[PDB]
Amino acid sequence: RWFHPNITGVEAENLLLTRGVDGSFLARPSKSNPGDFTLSVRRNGAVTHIKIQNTGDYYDLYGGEKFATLAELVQYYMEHHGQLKEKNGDVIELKYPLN
């Protein structure tokens, strides 16, 4: 249950900062793209947000590996800890689903 249909970006930061640990993550509805999803991830005591693209033919992170479903995208990044990297090259790790 990393998938939280009910909450906003702000509420996701609050949840991760108070009930999560570094590595905690969840997925939630995107505000800036109605109908789409976003990952909210805690690292070093702060929260980063990562938009998930759904083109209708696959899901991806606006780049990188393509997936048929959102659960398979989440699974792949929980299994491949080095593959999710910033512009400046630091890794964002999806370690612990926040249920």
Partner: peptide, 7 residues
């Protein structure tokens, strides 16, 4: 909210 820029 801080949105990461990837790659």
């Amino acid at each position: 909210l801080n949105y990461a820029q990837l790659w």
